[PDB]
Design an enzyme around this catalytic site. Structure first.
Site, PDB file in Angstrom:
ATOM      1  N   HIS A  43       3.679   5.688 -26.189  1.00 16.43           N
ATOM      2  CA  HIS A  43       2.524   5.636 -27.057  1.00 16.43           C
ATOM      3  C   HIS A  43       1.258   5.734 -26.231  1.00 16.43           C
ATOM      4  O   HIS A  43       1.261   5.570 -25.009  1.00 16.43           O
ATOM      5  CB  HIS A  43       2.519   4.377 -27.937  1.00 16.43           C
ATOM      6  CG  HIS A  43       2.164   3.117 -27.214  1.00 16.43           C
ATOM      7  ND1 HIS A  43       1.436   2.108 -27.805  1.00 16.43           N
ATOM      8  CD2 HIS A  43       2.454   2.689 -25.962  1.00 16.43           C
ATOM      9  CE1 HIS A  43       1.279   1.118 -26.946  1.00 16.43           C
ATOM     10  NE2 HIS A  43       1.890   1.445 -25.821  1.00 16.43           N
ATOM     11  N   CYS A  97      -3.167   0.565 -23.154  1.00 14.67           N
ATOM     12  CA  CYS A  97      -1.982  -0.231 -22.886  1.00 14.67           C
ATOM     13  C   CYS A  97      -1.584  -0.038 -21.433  1.00 14.67           C
ATOM     14  O   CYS A  97      -1.715   1.062 -20.886  1.00 14.67           O
ATOM     15  CB  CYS A  97      -0.832   0.177 -23.805  1.00 14.67           C
ATOM     16  SG  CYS A  97       0.731  -0.728 -23.569  1.00 14.67           S
ATOM     17  N   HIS A 141      -2.603   3.458 -32.430  1.00 13.26           N
ATOM     18  CA  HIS A 141      -1.631   4.126 -31.573  1.00 13.26           C
ATOM     19  C   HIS A 141      -1.385   5.570 -32.000  1.00 13.26           C
ATOM     20  O   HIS A 141      -1.448   5.913 -33.184  1.00 13.26           O
ATOM     21  CB  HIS A 141      -0.259   3.441 -31.583  1.00 13.26           C
ATOM     22  CG  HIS A 141      -0.293   1.962 -31.371  1.00 13.26           C
ATOM     23  ND1 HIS A 141       0.225   1.360 -30.244  1.00 13.26           N
ATOM     24  CD2 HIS A 141      -0.728   0.958 -32.166  1.00 13.26           C
ATOM     25  CE1 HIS A 141       0.091   0.050 -30.347  1.00 13.26           C
ATOM     26  NE2 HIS A 141      -0.487  -0.220 -31.502  1.00 13.26           N
TER      27      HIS A 141
END
Length: 147
Positions: A43, A97, A141
């Site tokens: 992702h 992330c 995302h």
């Protein structure tokens, strides 16, 4: 007669039908062609000031708004779909992330283990397919199912 989660929609700006997936928020012009215990996904995450943890390796204090995060997300989707940029390259450069280190790879998981909207989109994707914007407590995302 459409796979799970897909529906036909009319585009007002172009006056043409397209296909929309309400689980993954994917959309496309082309008509789309048990479920496994586990899937593997990568992702690209874009955090905003209301994320559950509003900081990352890219910036200590994430201040952008939700709609600014969505604008960045749509920009990345555009570049991926058009071939101007690879998913993995954009995740490495711009994902908030820490899995950016592994080109966005999160490894394999099963239902019940991830955040629910993330899980639903991941299992609604077919292998090699990519989601649209998926909203979770972490942020927004883009999800690519790789297995």
């Amino acid at each position: 007669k459409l796979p799970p989660g897909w529906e036909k929609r009319m585009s007002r700006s172009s006056g043409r039908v397209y296909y929309f997936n309400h689980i993954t928020n994917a959309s496309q012009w082309e008509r789309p062609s048990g479920e496994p215990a586990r899937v593997r996904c990568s992702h690209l995450l874009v955090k905003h000031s209301q994320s559950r943890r509003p900081s990352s390796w890219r910036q200590e204090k994430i201040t952008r708004t939700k709609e600014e995060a969505l604008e960045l997300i749509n920009g990345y989707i555009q570049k991926i779909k058009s071939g101007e940029e690879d998913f993995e390259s954009l995740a490495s450069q711009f994902s908030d992330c820490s899995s950016a280190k592994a080109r966005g790879d999160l490894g394999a998981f099963s239902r019940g283990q991830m955040q629910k909207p993330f899980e639903d989109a991941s299992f609604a994707l077919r292998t090699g397919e990519m989601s649209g914007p998926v909203f979770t407590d972490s942020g927004i995302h883009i999800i690519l199912r790789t297995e």
